[PDB]
Design a protein around this ligand. Structure first.
Ligand SMILES: NS(=O)(=O)c1c(F)c(F)c(SCCc2ccc(C(=O)O)cc2)c(F)c1NC1CCCCCCCCCCC1
Ligand SMILES: NS(=O)(=O)c1c(F)c(F)c(SCCc2ccc(C(=O)O)cc2)c(F)c1NC1CCCCCCCCCCC1
Ligand SMILES: [Zn+2]
Ligand SMILES: [Zn+2]
Lengths: 243, 241
């Protein structure tokens, strides 16, 4: 990874191990504001297998705020996962790796283009939630997972009807961890604001197997364990929106 | 064009109410590197008509944390008039005699105009100036030169000095909030760090600052502070409970 682009050996990279007892509570971290995420069924959205993950391109109008006057527009979402009987979340909590992780990537409003935001502090913000095993089938996630067989091949894509993107995220928008780090693939640009929800979302064991067993990557290898290793904080302090 | 960003919701200066400040233990001591200048090359001290400014050379590096790195561009002062305070920021309604600002540019940006309006592009360090019993010698190096730049738009060269000696010793205790520039264009996204500890000048020193320079026709350069702006739901953070 430092081979093909050396930003991946920068000092302030992601993902990181979250250690709640060492997190800094700041009352200034207000609840997350997400508007325009309840999408109608038309227009349909591009759901692509890109060889390294499954991604959903998002339209313009998904407005997000991390504070007052710190606004964002959602660009896309994608997922990280493991294999049969192996977790594949990127972030860990006290060394525990969760089954999977959703990332919703956004661009700061103050930037017109993604490539101006890269490497700039707060240019990009990601919302991250952990996916766990639960008793029920998750309806929001079945909308995406049921369509995965159709894009099993590296490079293929399909169209899915619009859905409530916020339905894919956890219950409590006032409880999260926050730090500044990087993208977790090349170019590994720094200045990315990561916000990681305290609460998880639940998927059936079948859904988690659908996600981990359906997609193929590059030759004929399985698209699995698509997570970067844990990176050192190097002096950074993870903050928390709750005592 | 009466400066459209000067009507933003999130402007500076503000009234700091310590009881409404949020303690955040993420806020570590500020670190400066390269503020101790050699005497040459000299720096340009300038009466720009609205303030006195010192332009700073390249290699003054400041950090607000790990990964939050800045380069110093300039400093300038805000002050009042005989018996009237002119700090920009207030604390629980109190206006201090004067204020120093050191304006910095993020090391993601090569030019000021790329940073303006961008979150965290510019960062200012701010400290209040009060009367103390002693002549402050770092300030004296600038204040003894104000007679040479009394005229609006004049300037003079001054030996490099310890720029960090114009600031308080205690870099641990401060307030921090997101706001704006206090002159047009008043662009938002500016990280303001305001020190708990103040800097001491002699009475004579403070009088020199307030009573020596002239502004735009033949009016004295005094009371060069903007009115305090509403927080408007922003929460000022504090590095200490
Ligand atoms: N965790 S992460 O957000 O960093 C991330 C990952 F970790 C990933 F593994 C991935 S998947 C591997 C990179 C990739 C992306 C798209 C294509 C394609 O469409 O053909 C091919 C390869 C990812 F997209 C994202 N996110 C973004 C792409 C990362 C490259 C930077 C380009 C600017 C951001 C563009 C939108 C967000 C997607
Ligand atoms: N508190 S503040 O930072 O907003 C500020 C003020 F409130 C001020 F009143 C002032 S003084 C009035 C603006 C000015 C600056 C320079 C000239 C000149 O050289 O001829 C003329 C007029 C100030 F300089 C600064 N700071 C200037 C220095 C930082 C470098 C330029 C960054 C671009 C923003 C342009 C506004 C001046 C900022
Ligand atoms: Zn990701
Ligand atoms: Zn100023």
């Amino acid at each position: 990874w430092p081979r093909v682009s050396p930003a991946c050996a920068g000092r302030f990279q992601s993902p990181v191990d979250i250690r709640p007892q060492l997190a800094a509570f700041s009352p200034a971290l207000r609840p997350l504001e997400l508007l325009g995420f309840q999408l109608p069924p038309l227009p349909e959205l591009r759901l692509r297998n890109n060889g390294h993950s499954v991604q959903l391109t998002l339209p313009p109008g998904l407005e997000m705020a991390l504070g007052p006057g710190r606004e964002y527009r959602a660009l896309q979402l994608h997922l990280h996962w493991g294999a049969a009987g192996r977790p594949g979340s990127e972030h860990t909590v006290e060394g525990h790796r969760f089954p999977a992780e959703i990332h919703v990537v956004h661009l700061s409003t103050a930037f017109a283009r993604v490539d101006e935001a890269l490497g700039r502090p707060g240019g990009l913000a990601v919302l991250a939630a952990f996916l766990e095993e639960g008793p029920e089938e998750n309806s929001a996630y079945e909308q995406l997972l049921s369509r995965l067989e159709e894009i099993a091949e590296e490079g293929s894509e399909t169209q899915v009807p619009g859905l409530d993107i916020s339905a894919l995220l956890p219950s409590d928008f006032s409880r999260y961890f926050q730090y500044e780090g990087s993208l977790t693939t090349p170019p590994c640009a720094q200045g990315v604001i990561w916000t990681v929800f305290n609460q998880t979302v639940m998927l059936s064991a079948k859904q988690l197997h659908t996600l981990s067993d359906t997609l193929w990557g590059p030759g004929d290898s399985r698209l699995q364990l698509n997570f970067r290793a844990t990176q050192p904080l190097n002096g950074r302090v993870i903050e928390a929106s709750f005592p």
